[PDB]
Amino acid sequence: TKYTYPATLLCDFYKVSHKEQYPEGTELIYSTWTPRTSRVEDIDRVVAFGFQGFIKKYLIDYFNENFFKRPKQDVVNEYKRVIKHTLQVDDPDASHIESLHELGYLPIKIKAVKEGTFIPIKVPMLTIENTIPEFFWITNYLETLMSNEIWQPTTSATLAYEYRKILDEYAMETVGNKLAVDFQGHDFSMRGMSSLESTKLSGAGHLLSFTGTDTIPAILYHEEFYNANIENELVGSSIPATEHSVMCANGQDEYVVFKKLITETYPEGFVSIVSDTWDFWNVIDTVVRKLKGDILKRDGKVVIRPDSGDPVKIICGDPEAKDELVRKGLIEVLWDIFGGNVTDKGYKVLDPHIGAIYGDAITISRCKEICKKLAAKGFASVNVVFGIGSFTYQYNTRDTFGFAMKATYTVVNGEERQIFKNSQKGLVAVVNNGNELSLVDELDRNAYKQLSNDDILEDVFINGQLLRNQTLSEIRELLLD
Amino acid sequence: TKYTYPATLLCDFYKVSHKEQYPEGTELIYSTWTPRTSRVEDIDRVVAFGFQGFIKKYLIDYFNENFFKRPKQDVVNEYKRVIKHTLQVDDPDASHIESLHELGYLPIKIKAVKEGTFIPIKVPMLTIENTIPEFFWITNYLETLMSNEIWQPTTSATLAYEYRKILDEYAMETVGNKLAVDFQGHDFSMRGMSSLESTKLSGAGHLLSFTGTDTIPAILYHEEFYNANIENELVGSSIPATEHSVMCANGQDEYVVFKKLITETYPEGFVSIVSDTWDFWNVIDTVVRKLKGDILKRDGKVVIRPDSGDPVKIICGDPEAKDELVRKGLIEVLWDIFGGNVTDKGYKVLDPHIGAIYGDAITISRCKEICKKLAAKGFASVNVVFGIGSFTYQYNTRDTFGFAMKATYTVVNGEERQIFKNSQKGLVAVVNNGNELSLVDELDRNAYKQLSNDDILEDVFINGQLLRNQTLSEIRELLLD
Numbered sequence: 001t002k003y004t005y006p007a008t009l010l011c012d013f014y015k016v017s018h019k020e021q022y023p024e025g026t027e028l029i030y031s032t033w034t035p036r037t038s039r040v041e042d043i044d045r046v047v048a049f050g051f052q053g054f055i056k057k058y059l060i061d062y063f064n065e066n067f068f069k070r071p072k073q074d075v076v077n078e079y080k081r082v083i084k085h086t087l088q089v090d091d092p093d094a095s096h097i098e099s100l101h102e103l104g105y106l107p108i109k110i111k112a113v114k115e116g117t118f119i120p121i122k123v124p125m126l127t128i129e130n131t132i133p134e135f136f137w138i139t140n141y142l143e144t145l146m147s148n149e150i151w152q153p154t155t156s157a158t159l160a161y162e163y164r165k166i167l168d169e170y171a172m173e174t175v176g177n178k179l180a181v182d183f184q185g186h187d188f189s190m191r192g193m194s195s196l197e198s199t200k201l202s203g204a205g206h207l208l209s210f211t212g213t214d215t216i217p218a219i220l221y222h223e224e225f226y227n228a229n230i231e232n233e234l235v236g237s238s239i240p241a242t243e244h245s246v247m248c249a250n251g252q253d254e255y256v257v258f259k260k261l262i263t264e265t266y267p268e269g270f271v272s273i274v275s276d277t278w279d280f281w282n283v284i285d286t287v288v289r290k291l292k293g294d295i296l297k298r299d300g301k302v303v304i305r306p307d308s309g310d311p312v313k314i315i316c317g318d319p320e321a322k323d324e325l326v327r328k329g330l331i332e333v334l335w336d337i338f339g340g341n342v343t344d345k346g347y348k349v350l351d352p353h354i355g356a357i358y359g360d361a362i363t364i365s366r367c368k369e370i371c372k373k374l375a376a377k378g379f380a381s382v383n384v385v386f387g388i389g390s391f392t393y394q395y396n397t398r399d400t401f402g403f404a405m406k407a408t409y410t411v412v413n414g415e416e417r418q419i420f421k422n423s424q425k426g427l428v429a430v431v432n433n434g435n436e437l438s439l440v441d442e443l444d445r446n447a448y449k450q451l452s453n454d455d456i457l458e459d460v461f462i463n464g465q466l467l468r469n470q471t472l473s474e475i476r477e478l479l480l481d
Numbered sequence: 482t483k484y485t486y487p488a489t490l491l492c493d494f495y496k497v498s499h500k501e502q503y504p505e506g507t508e509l510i511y512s513t514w515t516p517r518t519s520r521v522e523d524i525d526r527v528v529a530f531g532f533q534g535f536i537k538k539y540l541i542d543y544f545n546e547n548f549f550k551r552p553k554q555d556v557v558n559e560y561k562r563v564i565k566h567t568l569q570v571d572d573p574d575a576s577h578i579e580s581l582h583e584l585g586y587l588p589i590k591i592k593a594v595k596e597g598t599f600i601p602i603k604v605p606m607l608t609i610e611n612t613i614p615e616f617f618w619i620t621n622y623l624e625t626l627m628s629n630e631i632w633q634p635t636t637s638a639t640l641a642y643e644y645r646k647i648l649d650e651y652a653m654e655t656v657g658n659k660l661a662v663d664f665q666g667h668d669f670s671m672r673g674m675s676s677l678e679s680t681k682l683s684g685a686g687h688l689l690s691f692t693g694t695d696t697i698p699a700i701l702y703h704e705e706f707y708n709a710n711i712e713n714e715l716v717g718s719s720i721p722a723t724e725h726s727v728m729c730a731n732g733q734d735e736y737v738v739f740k741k742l743i744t745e746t747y748p749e750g751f752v753s754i755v756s757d758t759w760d761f762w763n764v765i766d767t768v769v770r771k772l773k774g775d776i777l778k779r780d781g782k783v784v785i786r787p788d789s790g791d792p793v794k795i796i797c798g799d800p801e802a803k804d805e806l807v808r809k810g811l812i813e814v815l816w817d818i819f820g821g822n823v824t825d826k827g828y829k830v831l832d833p834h835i836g837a838i839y840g841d842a843i844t845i846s847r848c849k850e851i852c853k854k855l856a857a858k859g860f861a862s863v864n865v866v867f868g869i870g871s872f873t874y875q876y877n878t879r880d881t882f883g884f885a886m887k888a889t890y891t892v893v894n895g896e897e898r899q900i901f902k903n904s905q906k907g908l909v910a911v912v913n914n915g916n917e918l919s920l921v922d923e924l925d926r927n928a929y930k931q932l933s934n935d936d937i938l939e940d941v942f943i944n945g946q947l948l949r950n951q952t953l954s955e956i957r958e959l960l961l962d
């Protein structure tokens with residue numbers, strides 16, 4: 001028997017108790033979603049992403065399938081059972097649940113900026129309110145769930161963009177175009193995300209900035225919620241790649257192993273071969289070097305993947321190593337063997353038959369450092385592909401960018417009031433102010449209606465209706481152009 | 482129809498390519514799940530938790546509903562479509578998917594230690610292997626998903642127990658029993674987890690040590706996967722509690738608002754009131770004090786909640802403060818107002834009508850410091866409830882306890898071989914060594930069989946049937962007794 005988590009209990013327990021605590025005559029509760037701070041250096045804007053997936057998944061699909069379409073008695077019973085046995089209330093009140101189910105839709109209105117927009121720290125990006133006085137309580141009820149579902153997709157998108165930002169600049173600095181950047185950020189993180197759902201949301205954020213990923217469910221997530229179709233557009237893509245357990249199973253005859261892989265198993269196209277199973281630098285000096293003709297013969301690219309050592313020292317060289325190959329580093333050594341071309345900016349790019357990827361403990365600062373030292377050696381940034389892992393995408397909180405749902409506005413017996421402690425007060429809008437986006441708050445309903453044409457927040461969901469349906473392609477256009 | 486993420490594509494992209502890479506005649510792959518290191522100080526053991534949930538959710542239900550019970554052609558086509566348009570293969574080989582579907586079950590054997598067991602760092606807790614040679618590739622394939630799903634529930638379960646370990650120990654020292662500890666750890670973290678699924682996994686981990694939670698989905702998760710039932714056992718419990726937005730809506734006549742909350746809205750039972758919306762110490766010194774008789778007349782408890790300042794200094798006092806109230810802190814001031822009882826060992830316990838809860842930026846170290854500084858002034862540790870939030874449960878990685886899944890053993894054309902990079906080699910077992918769980922590795926099948934008796938890993942899932950079905954009550958008794 002399939003277990004249904006009631007749509008009316010996807011919250012903190014105390015959310016259930018707030019309805020009775022509001023003042024009598026409360027008709028409206030209005031709350032905003034804001035990144036209040038940044039804990040990541042050089043990042044003062046966040047990449048708005050994730051509202052549509054949450055709205056389609058939970059407010060439309062989940063509530064319709066598991067609440068509104070079901071018998072009224074069943075949703076009432078499921079709510080009463082949990083309240084009765086967890087709050088020790090002998091006879092829980094569910095008349096409001098009855099009334100919501102009889103209404104037949106969620107009486108809320110959600111506005112949000114376009115997904116893909118850069119939002120400065122301390123500028124709200126989404127608002128939610130109730131559209132019928134009787135359900136003043138619904139807004140606050142949903143807050144927990146919304147926060148639970150939308151802070152990770154934005155965080156990942158933002159972090160992903162930072163890599164992208166670095167990689168774009170260096171590309172323009174060292175190549176003069178960014179054509180290779182889409183594949184330079186490669187999601188490796190799925191095994192280290194905390195759940196398949198978190199995997200999907202984080203990986204979708206990654207796919208806003210890059211097309212390279214190993215997180216298959218992220219590609220399909222964009223198919224499910226952002227109208228993507230892999231048959232018509234590059235959502236994500238990846239390459240055949242070996243792994244340490246397979247490398248160890250095949251044995252120590254690394255010449256024959258590599259030769260079989262690149263001449264027989266993958267005679268053409270891309271193939272990534274992890275090379276540090278037994279001795280990395282020996283593999284470069286003795287296997288790859290001996291395979292030069294075969295590598296140059298394939299219509300494709302053999303990508304070398306180290307998976308240990310210091311990323312910067314392995315890629316760019318260790319200046320204090322006695323050994324020449326260790327001193328030079330992978331990119332220079334592969335250049336020495338295979339050569340390549342010179343870009344319009346005077347930088348060296350590897351011959352397209354050989355390549356490099358590094359995906360162990362990659363961080364934003366290490367990506368920046370690798371690009372910087374490579375450029376100092378005359379090598380373009382596009383010579384390395386960065387495997388961006390769970391250290392980047394999992395190791396955050398919702399306070400990494402200071403996100404919070406805050407009630408800022410309420411109507412009680414027709415009286416407008418501002419909600420705060422001691423920050424945003426009253427109704428809010430975000431307007432183009434010169435070349436920046438600016439918060440406007442302390443608005444009453446009249447002033448807010450006046451500003452509506454200038455508010456870059458758009459109606460996204462009212463009363464069960466989806467009002468805006470963005471595509472992955474549209475969001476990528478907004479973000480990167 | 483609704484979007485199906487194919488059961489055969491919940492993995493890193495390169496896992497798809499590994500099948501054709503193994504040596505010819507590979508017949509068995511055997512992998513272990515191990516916490517290889519600890520990044521949390523004073524935590525050298527991990528609380529095994531989550532395997533049963535993952536197996537039930539994905540290995541049984543997801544593969545049955547979305548792969549086996551569906552027509553062969555559909556599951557072949559979905560896989561082919563993704564592989565074609567993401568790996569640039571014009572005709573992907575799906576014969577192995579077809580063969581798995583024809584088999585009708587997962588030819589898989591998973592063994593694990595009992596959930597609730599303390600596992601030392603660097604000792605494996607779970608193994609996985611294929612039961613039919615042709616499906617050697619399935620073990621590797623499942624690796625990613627299983628990791629993605631089982632590191633968080635264990636990590637949370639371990640972190641929660643850390644709090645438990647402290648709260649038990651101070652309880653024994655200050656009161657002489659642990660009767661209060663079950664509610665002293667209260668999960669507040671839902672809005673800050675990265676997804677609702679991660680919320681369920683983490684909160685389920687929290688509920689092994691405590692019964693206090695605001696995470697309703699975690700209680701229901703234990704109902705879904707761990708045979709719990711809130712009608713017959715105490716799975717999780719909570720209380721009515723106010724929030725800043727509610728308090729602000731009710732206005733600054735705080736005496737009237739508090740009095741209505743405790744005499745009319747919640748005349749009995751527990752009720753938590755957040756008291757720092759405008760001035761925390763004025764509320765304590767003016768509102769709570771003036772409500773002393775009403776508070777004492779209720780059949781229940783009023784729980785004061787601060788949500789700002791330094792947690793240690795608010796609870797135990799700021800010794801550098803000039804104001805009596807601030808220097809003494811919440812617990813001593815509440816004692817001055819209401820008094821209470823004195824334990825056998827000389828420690829003060831607040832009158833049962835009044836209480837304290839703190840749930841902002843709570844850490845293990847802060848919990849310990851608050852217990853220590855309360856005891857240093859003769860206050861029992863049971864006087865305050867700890868609201869453990871997303872800072873604790875979200876801000877981790879898989880490598881917080883060094884979790885990795887590594888193939889350690891393979892059979893190739895009948896020959897047993899060890900797998901390891903340059904660590905566990907071969908088949909493994911975990912034996913009790915005088916209440917010291919130790920790893921035994923480098924075992925061939927014969928040696929592993931001779932050790933079957935002393936191996937604490939038990940059969941959990943073989944060839945489609947769940948063989949061990951632990952209850953939440955069993956796990957709690959194993960953990961705490």
Ligand SMILES: NC(=O)c1ccc[n+]([C@@H]2O[C@H](COP(=O)([O-])OP(=O)(O)OC[C@H]3O[C@@H](n4cnc5c(N)ncnc54)[C@H](O)[C@@H]3O)[C@@H](O)[C@H]2O)c1
Nearest residue numbers: 188189192214241359360361362389390391493495878880
């Ligand atoms: N197609 C492919 O080749 C492919 C696909 C997927 C994964 N992979 C590989 O699998 C691994 C991915 O695993 P990942 O993304 O979880 O690791 P990661 O590379 O993102 O980071 C793991 C390392 O970062 C540090 N780290 C992580 N958590 C930390 C913490 N709390 N505190 C301090 N340091 C911490 C540690 O040094 C850790 O070893 C990688 O080795 C990847 O290359 C490869």
Ligand SMILES: NC(=O)c1ccc[n+]([C@@H]2O[C@H](COP(=O)([O-])OP(=O)(O)OC[C@H]3O[C@@H](n4cnc5c(N)ncnc54)[C@H](O)[C@@H]3O)[C@@H](O)[C@H]2O)c1
Nearest residue numbers: 012014397399400669670673695722840841842870871872
């Ligand atoms: N029944 C109830 O009263 C109830 C229930 C649920 C939640 N709540 C309240 O809602 C809030 C829960 O929020 P939470 O659990 O996500 O946060 P938390 O209270 O566990 O921690 C928040 C603080 O921890 C620090 N933090 C978080 N991430 C950080 C990071 N990357 N780096 C450095 N510091 C970081 C910060 O100081 C942050 O302000 C709390 O205020 C809680 O009291 C109350």
